[model samples]
Target: TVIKFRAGVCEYNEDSRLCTPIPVQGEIEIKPNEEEELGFWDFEWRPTEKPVGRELDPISLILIPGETMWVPIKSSKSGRIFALVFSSNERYFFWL
Candidate 1:
């Protein structure tokens, strides 16, 4: 299945079987229905050495409006759906 555009999160009223769009921490790029497995990266680490007496926490990647990011998903029916994220900084991926 293919979705034309990303839809905002919505609440489903069981009795009414209706949905209402609502602002959320993150938008639902892919719906739970259909079929596929997708997720986001949550690697939090500092690249630089810590100071003698201080340890700093690395900032997490924040996606912003209109930003595009690639999120790989495993699928059976449609091969795979690659996700796109739009944010402030340019993130580089390194394979180990």
Candidate 2:
């Protein structure tokens, strides 16, 4: 299941890709310009923050295991909504 950050909703998944707990504790900061970097199965992050100013909502992302690319969730989706990705890896809208 893919969990949407902030929304608290879970994205339904049809595949075996279960939604794991997001490691937000030591997670790296995200930039709004970046893509959705906050996802359920993401972990890696930028080595440093953007060398510039930002707005109220800072961008953040989760690095999915077995992958070098990071799942930019916060920057992509800036609203307080959560969802779970079904087994098919498609996100299922649960609630706001």
Candidate 3:
């Protein structure tokens, strides 16, 4: 599924280009902001603590060092939470 962010929220694009907002099922403890230069409209962050919520599985938490372009969302698998990291023009999935 194609994901898009609007107003600091993540959404999925449907076949007709309809963007559906993903519900925030939990809160994540992130380092807030990064010192590195982020591209136009790009934000980099690092999760400092594991997620404690109904949607995200803590086991899926694979820590990546340093700041990264991360988008927090709910997975298709029963709304499981994950962090969608953007790097090298690619997307990486990490449990939130």
Candidate 4:
């Protein structure tokens, strides 16, 4: 139930039993897993609106079955910026 240090779309290959990491060009989209339990999830990202800083509290959501959340990833003159996702129960983390 813990997915850690990941960015963008991820798929678990049934035959290979491994996940393929797909890079995000702009945003992040998460699909519902087969587990039916309602829970809390946290999404973290730097905004296009702010200068990069140390503030790290993320937006929290109540997870529902078959629901998806689309979050826009920030960018700058440098390039694609930072984003992350983690369950309330498991503190997974990553950076762009």
Assess every candidate by TM-score.
Answer: 0.20, 0.19, 0.24, 0.24
Per-candidate Cα RMSD to the true structure, in Å, reads 18.6, 14.2, 12.0, 14.6
Which run of 10 residues does model 2 get worst, by summed lDDT?
50-59
The residue pairs found clashing in candidate 4 are: none
Model 2's C-alpha root-mean-square deviation from the true structure amounts to: 14.2
Better of 1 and 2 by lDDT: 1
TM-score of 2: 0.19
Ranking by lDDT: 3, 1, 4, 2
Better of 1 and 4 by TM-score: 4
When summed lDDT is taken over every stretch of 10 residues in candidate 3, the lowest stretch is 1-10
**Candidate 1 residues 1-96, lDDT tens each?**
422222222234799974333223122222333333433333322324323333333323323234556544424443233333455444422111
Per-residue CA lDDT of model 3 for 1-87, tens digit only, reads 111221222344667763343343232333222432332223222322333332432212223435555455544533333455546
Where is model 1 more than 4 Å wrong at Cα? 1-41, 48-59, 62-68, 71-87
Local error of candidate 4 at residue 87 (angstroms): 9.6
- Model 3 Cα displacement at 41 (Å)? 15
Candidate 4, overall lDDT? 0.33
